[PDB]
Amino acid sequence: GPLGSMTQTFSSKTEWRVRAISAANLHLRTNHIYVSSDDIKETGYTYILPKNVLKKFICISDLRAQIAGYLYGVSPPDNPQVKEIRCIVMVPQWGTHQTVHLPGQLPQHEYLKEMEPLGWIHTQPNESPQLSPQDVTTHAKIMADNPSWDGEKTIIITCSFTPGSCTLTAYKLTPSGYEWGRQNTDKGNNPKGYLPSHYERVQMLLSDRFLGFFMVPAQSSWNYNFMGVRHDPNMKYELQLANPKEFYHEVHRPSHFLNFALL
């Protein structure tokens, strides 16, 4: 019983700083990237992901809050069943450990008009056997709103942080999963009606043979996880040909600098 003999005082211990020290070391994981290859048939398309933009995507991410990129690409001159991923587009976004939050507006720029959309890629805190129902809902709603997203051609690549490394698995929606994700409003962990036959693995290879590139917003940066207020599902944005800053860069958290200066 010490109200007076023993007195202690709380000292702040903010979490984003531990996550920032953690994200400084993401580059170690880019020398240990693995792809799941449990899909066997090759009946679907084969998706080739250039390592350069993969590694940059990993480097700009966070270990807890998910980030997403849009995939754009084409089939090689004589091989229509192969989809080369040529561009990853970063749009104003914010996220949690389970999902990402994107604007309704898909990328629009002159440089992308000769490519076709191939879906999206997102980081994940832990490896999973199945595609998330959040992901099935996200992909299905994007498809219902944007007809340029062929369900038989657009994929979800998941990039899971496994110890010391990164595991990549690629999925697509099946018709049943499209029709379920469209109407799904419970985005808990197990919503009504969710099914494993709603998605399927698509084959996916990492390549060193060609290089991808990034496009990023023209006025802002992409990371709004420190500004989630100023993010609006209807926000409009343009794009430029430039490489994205990393998660905890100064331009993503200007209040940490101005508010410390005020003290």
């Binding site: 000292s11 702040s12 211990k13 903010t14 700083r17 531990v18 920032a20 020290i21 400084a24 580059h27 350069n52 940059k56 040529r86 440089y111 043979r209 060609f210 290089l211 991808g212 590139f213 006025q219 802002s220 430029q240 040909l241 430039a242 490489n243 990393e246 905890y248 100064e250 331009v251 958290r253 200007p254 940490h256 600098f257 101005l258 410390f260 200066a261 003290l263």
Partner: protein, 1721 residues
């Protein structure tokens, strides 16, 4: 390198107490001193001394008895004081190094004045003016505030001389501008050390003639090793230069001054003066209070009690100045004293009741805004420290000088920077917090001396009173220091590794022996010899090592192993050699300790975030004594969990506190702990240069992310803000409330660019700030970017970046320059493919700037690169341009070479012709495989031929095959041989004279550039050798010159040079020879010789060679096999990279060519000698010595004494020659011949001779591949054509089985050389950038009459073929026929438009074109159309000879005149009386150099060998520029300027000013002979001819040979009788034809070319007949003529009336003075 050494422990030799070390053990006080006792403190009193009565009976020297140049420096003084009077002779009448020891304040800086005045006097003209650009004086002062006071007072005493005195400042690039205009630099030791550490190019350090070292007793401080480094470097450099530097040391009176004097090279008998403490201006009665209480509370109580009692002994009677040692302590003790005065009712003693000073105090207190100053000023107490306003501090100073403030508490700053004595001084404690030491420590000796020096006002008091209060156990120390007994020691050991690294990085120390020598100049050395016991040496050690040879070797060995462990130096323990490194260089140049750069090298990685960057910084060894104290741990913690950059370490670690302190300094937080605030100041005072070292490290490694974060952090440190803040904050004049309103408005800065003042004021919600913010927005630096991508191959890409400034300049904001980095980053923004510095000068703030560079590229092409241009000092100031490759068109991969066929070696007998075979059969028995493969085609057909093969393939014999064939077909057949270099053409001329004139008795000629000379040469000769421009002037007029059409053979050598800097003239003349061949239905055979070309097929197609006649050999087929080695050196500083090449040069000789001859190419004249000497130095310290000499020493003594360069004699003796532009051609011949014969084995050649070198070698080494261009002030890459020419010198077919070449280059060039020396070379046309003068000539000759013709013209060029093969290079985007048509049309349009605006041509119906007058003048004299335009825009109907010299010296033909030498400033100061003068002077401009060298020529002034060849090039064009002016004037009817320009032609020919004696033309006439002839009254050349022979012999006073030269000139002098007749003179009819026929008769037929020795080219006599009228100055007619024995000439005019007019007739020379005739009619 004496082996049995030992590794010492430097730390155990260090004097730990710094300036507080007390070497003396006993202390003796003046007579009359005594101690008193009191409870817990002892007092020692020392009485004021009496002045030494005059013993030497030396009266004070009156200013009037000084030398008169020195008297203006003593204006307003009557006589020097006693010290200056005893020093006057040594200071003013000798250059003897001095050491003056005198109590602080006795006159020492007036002695330094006298020294500076001696130096100033050395540079005083007869005009009274001073050559302020002929010298510099360095004044080294310990404290910055002292530096500033000295700048003021020295500038004020020396104003009357026009001397600038200034402080050296922190900015590194733009300040050297002012440093050029500063004659006296005042700086601290450390700043002069940093400056002379960088060394480098464009240094004014060479001008330094006098260094003053004030307060040289700083030697005893921890800063003392800087002074040792400075003096040792200065004295060794005096020896390396033989240029003297006077050293003046000013010291307090302390023991070991005899050793200090030894260290300064002061003769004790002549330059040492010691004045004891009795020479203090005001006698000093000293009181020392030493407190014994060890309890802190009681001790500070006791201190305030002693202070109060001492103050009460002076209250009302004397001012009291109390020094305390922090800023807060000034107010704290002022308030302590004031409170104890009010508690004791004593405040009334300081201010008497009703004093006007009491009211002045109340007033200024109420007006003052310093709250401490407000609280204290009414009582007569004040504070003074750095943290106060300048107006506040000026108030305190003025009110203390005014006897108003009776108690002033202050810091050391006031004692150093301001002049303010007080009757009483109290030093309150001697304890100070040193962040560097991390703890409390005793005050520095310098601070104490200065502070106590402030007691006693000089002309108001009769005694000062200094009271020092300290710990009892420090009494002896302070008693020693203030009573002449604290010995000055050396602290050098503590800094030995760092100091030594500086001398290694500078090249001054290359091995341990050098380092032992260097340490022999240290003050450390002199103390070690005089007092070995102090420095860890036993007296037995010394008697065994009397010069301390071994001890110095051991110290140097210890230091070297430390530097080597830290990777700053590569130390070969066996040899003792020292190899510099990039880390070592950065450590020296950013003034960083060697442990710190080891840490940086160990921790920095490309993946570093801001987090590890701040940590890496916080681990610097500058901060190794910083600790986290318990009482800081709360405040630190409050900040640690709020800093925006996370910290991984606990706050128990010093590194975490240092990191937080940086982050708080940037956020501008005010801290509370006093320890914390002083630590933060120390940590951030050095963060900028430490972080700028990180920047340089990571930028030069190509790390793009870290280069961005590190430059960013430098700028946040310097601007005191984060990126995240409004960049508008960087305008200090902008009020902070507004910027914070805007930062709250939060919108992106960039959108402010697209709003006008009104919408600005709307978004802000402040309307007036609308216009102010608009202005600042557009003052913010901003650049627009665009690229022209130019593929070179499929893997190398040239980029042209255009930088367009997009902001308003304002010198208030931007200064006079703004600096940027251009960074070329790859697809991923991870690698800097290329970077460079870019300086936008205020001069050019509105002009576009062009940058060109190369980047590698690959297949499959990457999506894009990025070009970042980022400000070097502005935060948030950057532009990035994506460079996409989605539409890059690559050139087709280049073809396989022509197979080298294994033919049997072709015997000389193949030529089937004994006369032809006599050319070669002595030299060799068989032609090489290339000659053997092309022989059948060259010799046995008339097919056009292309031969491509490396230099040294024998391609000139291939040309000889075609000439021999021609000689068989046509007995008088004509071959024109074009080579692009004049020195190449002169070598070819000697060899082909020997082969084809002496042997075959054909006629060989070399074109000279004189059109009538060259027409006769082209007529008579069968082999005409020429450079391109000489053939251009000729063959432009081919329609009217049958000899240009009747050319049988056209050979062009080194044709790959179409792609280089002078390629367009070569492309044009080759296109012209093809076009003439197609006109004349009898084709001209062409043979092109080239280096290996990747696009050889394109050259061959352009010249009409079939595939079977195109021999496209690649470098692997050189008949002497070449072994090429490319060594990269990863040093980005040029001087240091050359130093690191020095031993590799020697090692390359011994590896690749230890017995056979070696040629070393170096980038400049200076380096040739330096590298010769270094090769000899390395030879001597090696086992093989003099191994390069093969003639005996006595065989080449006759050779040696014929040379004037004595260093060249010395090095030649040891087997090493050198060649540079500055040697007399005979010296070059002597060295070249000693090399050819084998006497000497190595020759060090300047890069600029690589085309006219007439020797070859087994091994060529190219030492660096860049050279400094003094016009653009930057390093320029060697053109690849020069490198191939250099490499071609490693080729000796008759002697060697192989050639060897080593190219030593900066590492960022290695890839490029491997690409463009191992593979054949792609060449492009640059004719589309040089079209105007060729289009103009073609419109003059009617080859182009319209725009369609101009397109058809272009189709004949190599440009036109390469546009199809590489469209992106010529800024085409497709190769379709209509793309090509459109591009050609636009080129034509742009060029005819420029011509027509320049009034060179006319354009009728926007279709037809026709030559105008100016265009015909440009074409005829082969002058740049812009020159002729400028002539039309500058010449007037009244212009004079000075105008003419200005006009012609500003012609375009002189912009490329070589620039470097700085005696131009000396000729410019002689231009105070140069006969003709104009206006402003610049020293860099090539046009001003040409104007100066022209005035030097007309005034027969002998210049450097370099300036001599420059004058020769200028004179090579002056005559035709003058004739162009003459035609411009005569076309405008202006008579006076036309005749003045005919005179100016005369003057430049005969080297002669406007009005001299015509007798100045005669050989061997001096001033005396002209005086004598004028005395007899002859004044004329014809008068010399008229004299009776013996009479003129008795007059001349001249040799017989000299009289005969006079006679040869007098026979060749023009002797012309003219007679003129006006035809039809009877019938004067207005408006009609006036025919004047003038005849010219020559008394003695011409006997040769003009006699004009001082003119380089050989001229022929030229005349103009003018008929202008003088009254109206109307040039009426004119006709130019060449005269043999007799000639008739017609002049046309159209009458003005039937008014019986009057005209003057002029017959005017262009070559001789005196022979001009005037008549009238």
């Amino acid at each position: 390198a004496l082996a049995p050494r030992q590794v010492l422990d430097l730390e155990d030799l260090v004097f730990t107490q710094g300036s507080h070390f007390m070497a003396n053990k006993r202390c003796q006080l003046p007579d009359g001193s005594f101690r008193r006792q009191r409870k817990g403190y002892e007092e020692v009193h020392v009485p004021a001394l009496k002045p030494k009565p005059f013993g030497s009976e030396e009266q004070l020297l009156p200013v009037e008895k000084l030398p008169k140049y020195a008297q203006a420096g003593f204006e307003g003084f009557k006589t020097l004081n006693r010290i200056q009077s005893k020093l006057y002779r040594a200071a003013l009448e000798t250059d003897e190094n001095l050491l003056l020891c005198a109590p602080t304040g006795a006159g020492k800086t007036n002695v330094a004045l006298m020294c500076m005045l001696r130096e100033i006097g050395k540079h005083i003209n007869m005009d009274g003016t001073i050559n302020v650009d002929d010298f510099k004086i360095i004044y080294i002062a310990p404290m910055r505030s002292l530096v500033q006071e000295m700048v003021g007072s020295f500038g004020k005493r020396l104003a009357t001389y026009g001397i600038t005195v200034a402080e050296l400042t922190g900015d590194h690039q733009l300040c050297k501008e002012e440093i050029s205009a500063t004659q006296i630099i005042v700086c601290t030791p450390e700043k002069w050390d940093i400056i002379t550490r960088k060394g480098g190019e464009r240094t004014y350090t060479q001008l330094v003639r006098l260094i003053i070292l004030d307060e040289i007793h700083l030697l005893h401080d921890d800063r003392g090793p800087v002074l040792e480094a400075l003096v040792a470097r200065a004295i060794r450099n005096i020896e390396m230069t033989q240029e003297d530097v006077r050293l003046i040391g000013l010291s307090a009176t302390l023991p070991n001054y005899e050793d200090v004097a030894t260290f300064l090279r002061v003769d004790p008998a002549k330059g040492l003066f010691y004045f004891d403490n009795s020479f203090r201006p005001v006698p000093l009665e000293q009181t020392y209070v030493g407190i014994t209480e060890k309890k802190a509370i009681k001790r500070f109580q006791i201190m305030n009690e002693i202070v109060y009692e001492k103050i009460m002994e002076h209250a009302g009677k004397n001012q009291v100045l109390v020094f305390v040692h922090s800023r807060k302590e000034t107010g704290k003790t002022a308030r302590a004293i004031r409170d104890m005065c009010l508690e004791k009712d004593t405040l009334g003693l300081f201010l008497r009741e009703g004093s006007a000073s009491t009211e002045v105090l109340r007033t200024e207190a109420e007006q003052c805004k310093n709250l401490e100053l407000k609280d204290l000023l009414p009582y007569g107490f004040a504070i003074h420290h750095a943290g106060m306003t300048r107006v506040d501090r000026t108030l305190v100073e003025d009110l203390f000088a005014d006897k108003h403030i009776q108690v002033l508490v202050s810091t050391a700053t006031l004692a150093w920077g301001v002049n303010l004595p007080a009757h009483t001084v109290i030093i309150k404690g001697t304890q100070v917090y040193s962040p560097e030491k991390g703890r409390w420590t005793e005050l520095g000796a310098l601070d104490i001396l200065q502070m106590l020096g402030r007691a006693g006002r000089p002309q108001y008091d009769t005694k000062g009173e200094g009271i020092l209060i300290t710990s009892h156990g420090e009494l002896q120390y302070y008693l020693s220091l203030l009573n002449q007994q604290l010995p000055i020691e050396s602290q050098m050991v503590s800094k030995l590794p760092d100091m030594l690294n500086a001398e290694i990085v500078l090249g001054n120390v290359q091995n341990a022996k050098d380092a032992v020598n260097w340490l022999g100049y240290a003050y450390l050395y002199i103390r070690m010899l005089r007092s070995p016991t102090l420095y860890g040496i036993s007296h037995d050690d010394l008697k065994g090592d009397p010069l301390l040879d071994q001890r110095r070797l051991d110290l140097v060995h210890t230091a070297a192993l430390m530097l080597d462990k830290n990777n700053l130096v590569k130390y070969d323990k066996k040899t003792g050699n020292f190899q510099v490194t990039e880390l070592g260089r950065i450590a020296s140049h950013y003034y960083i300790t060697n442990d710190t750069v080891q840490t940086y090298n160990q921790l920095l990685k490309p993946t570093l975030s801001e987090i590890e960057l701040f940590r890496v910084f916080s681990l610097s060894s500058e901060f190794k004594n910083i600790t986290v104290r318990e009482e800081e741990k709360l405040e630190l913690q409050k900040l640690l969990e709020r800093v925006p950059i996370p910290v991984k370490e606990s706050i128990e670690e010093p590194s975490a506190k240092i990191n937080v302190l940086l982050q708080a300094f940037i956020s501008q937080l005010k801290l509370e702990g006093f320890a914390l605030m002083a630590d933060m100041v120390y940590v951030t005072q050095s963060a900028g240069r430490l972080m700028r070292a990180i920047f340089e490290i990571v930028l030069n490694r190509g790390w793009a992310q870290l280069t961005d974060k590190t430059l960013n952090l430098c700028k946040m440190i310097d601007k005191r803000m984060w990126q995240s803040m409004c960049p508008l904050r960087q305008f200090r004049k902008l009020p902070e409330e507004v910027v914070k309103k805007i930062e709250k408005k939060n919108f992106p800065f960039e959108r402010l660019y697209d709003l006008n003042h009104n919408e600005i004021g709307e978004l802000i919600r402040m309307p007036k700030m609308g216009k102010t913010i608009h202005k600042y927005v557009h003052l913010f630096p901003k650049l627009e970017l665009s690229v022209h991508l130019q593929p070179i191959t499929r893997s190398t890409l040239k980029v042209e970046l255009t930088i367009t400034p997009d902001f308003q300049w304002d010198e208030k904001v931007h200064g006079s320059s703004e600096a940027f980095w251009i960074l070329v980053e790859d697809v991923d923004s991870e690698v800097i493919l290329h970077h460079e510095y870019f300086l936008l000068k205020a001069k050019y703030a509105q002009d576009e700037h062009l940058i060109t560079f190369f980047v590698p590229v690959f297949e499959p092409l990457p999506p894009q690169y990025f070009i970042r241009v980022v400000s070097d000092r502005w935060l948030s100031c950057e532009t990035q341009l994506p460079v996409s490759f989605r539409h890059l068109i690559l050139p087709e991969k280049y073809p396989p070479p022509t197979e080298l066929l294994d033919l049997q070696p072709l015997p000389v007998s193949a030529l089937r012709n004994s006369a032809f075979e006599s050319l070669y059969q002595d030299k060799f028995p068989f032609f090489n495989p290339i000659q053997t493969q092309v022989f059948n085609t060259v010799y046995n057909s008339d097919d056009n031929v292309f031969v491509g093969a490396p230099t040294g393939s024998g391609k000139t014999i291939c040309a000889e095959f075609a000439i021999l064939r021609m000689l068989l077909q046509s007995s008088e057949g004509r071959c024109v041989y074009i080579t692009p270099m004049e020195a190449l053409a002169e070598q070819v001329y000697m060899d082909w004279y020997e082969k084809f004139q002496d042997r075959l008795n054909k006629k060989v000629v070399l074109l000279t550039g004189e059109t009538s000379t060259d027409l006769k040469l082209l007529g008579k000769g069968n082999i005409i050798i020429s450079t391109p421009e000489k053939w251009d002037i000729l063959s432009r007029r081919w329609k009217q010159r049958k000899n240009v059409q009747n050319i049988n053979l056209f050979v062009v050598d080194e044709v790959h040079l179409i792609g280089g800097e002078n390629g367009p003239v070569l492309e044009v003349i080759c296109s012209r020879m093809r076009y003439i061949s197609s006109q004349i239905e009898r084709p001209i055979r062409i043979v092109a010789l080239s280096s290996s070309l990747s696009n050889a097929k394109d050259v061959a197609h352009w010249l009409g060679c079939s595939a079977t006649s195109t021999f496209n050999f690649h470098p692997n087929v050189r008949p002497v096999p070449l072994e090429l080695h490319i060594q990269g050196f990863n040093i980005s500083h040029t001087q240091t990279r050359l130093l690191s090449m020095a031993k590799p040069v020697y090692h390359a000789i011994t590896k690749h060519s230890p017995k056979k001859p070696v040629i070393v190419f170096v980038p400049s004249r200076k380096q040739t000698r330096l590298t010769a000497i270094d090769i000899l130095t390395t030879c001597a310290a090696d086992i093989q010595r003099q191994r390069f000499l093969h003639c005996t020493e006595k065989d080449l003594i006759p050779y040696l004494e014929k040379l004037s360069d004595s260093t060249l004699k010395e090095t030649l003796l040891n087997g090493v020659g050198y060649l540079h532009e500055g040697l007399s051609p005979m010296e070059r011949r002597l060295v070249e011949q000693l090399f050819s014969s084998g006497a000497i084995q190595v020759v060090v050649a300047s890069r600029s001779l690589c085309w006219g070198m007439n020797v070859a070698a087994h091994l060529v080494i190219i030492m660096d591949t860049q050279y400094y261009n003094g016009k653009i002030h930057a390093y320029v890459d060697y053109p690849i054509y020069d490198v191939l020419q250099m490499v071609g010198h490693a080729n000796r077919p008759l002697q060697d089985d192989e050639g060897r070449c080593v190219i030593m280059c900066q590492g960022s060039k290695k890839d490029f050389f491997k690409k463009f020396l191992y593979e054949p070379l792609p060449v492009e046309s640059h004719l589309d950038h040089c079209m105007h003068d060729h289009f103009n000539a073609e419109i003059v000759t009617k080859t182009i009459e319209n725009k369609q013709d101009a397109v058809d013209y272009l189709t004949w060029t190599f440009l036109y073929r390469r546009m199809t093969q590489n469209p992106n290079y010529y800024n085409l985007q497709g190769i379709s026929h209509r793309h090509l048509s459109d591009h050609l049309s636009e080129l034509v349009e742009q060029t005819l438009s420029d011509l027509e605006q320049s009034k060179c041509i006319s354009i009728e119906d926007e279709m037809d074109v026709a030559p105008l007058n100016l265009g015909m003048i440009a074409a005829y004299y082969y002058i740049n159309y812009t020159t002729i335009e400028l002539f039309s825009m500058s010449l007037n109907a009244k212009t004079k000879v000075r105008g003419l010299i200005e006009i012609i010296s500003n012609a375009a033909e002189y912009e490329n005149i070589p620039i470097r030498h700085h005696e131009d400033n000396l000729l410019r100061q002689l231009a105070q009386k140069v006969p003709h003068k104009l206006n402003n002077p610049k020293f860099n401009d090539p046009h001003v150099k040409t104007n100066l060298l022209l005035q030097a020529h007309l005034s027969r002034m002998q210049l450097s060998a370099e300036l001599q060849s420059d004058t020769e090039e200028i004179l090579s064009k002056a005559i035709r520029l003058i004739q162009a002016c003459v035609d411009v004037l005569s076309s405008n009817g202006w008579l006076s300027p036309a005749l003045a320009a005919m005179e100016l032609a005369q003057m430049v020919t005969q080297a002669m000013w406007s009005k001299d004696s015509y007798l100045k033309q005669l050989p061997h006439f001096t001033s005396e002979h002209i005086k004598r002839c004028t005395d007899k009254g002859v004044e004329s050349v014809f008068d010399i001819m008229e004299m009776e022979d013996e009479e003129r012999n008795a007059l001349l006073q001249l040799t017989d040979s000299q009289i005969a030269d006079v006679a040869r000139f007098c026979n060749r002098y023009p002797n012309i009788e003219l007679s003129y007749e006006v035809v039809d003179k009877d019938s004067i009819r207005s408006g009609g034809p006036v025919v004047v026929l003038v005849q010219l008769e020559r008394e003695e037929e011409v006997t040769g070319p003009v006699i004009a020795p001082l003119f380089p080219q050989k001229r022929e006599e030229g005349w103009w007949v003018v008929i202008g009228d003088a009254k109206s100055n109307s040039l009426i007619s004119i006709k130019r003529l060449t005269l043999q024995q007799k000639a008739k000439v017609k002049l046309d005019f159209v009458a003005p009336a039937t008014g019986a007019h009057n005209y003057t007739l002029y017959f005017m020379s262009d070559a001789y003075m005196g022979c001009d005739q005037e008549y009238k009619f």
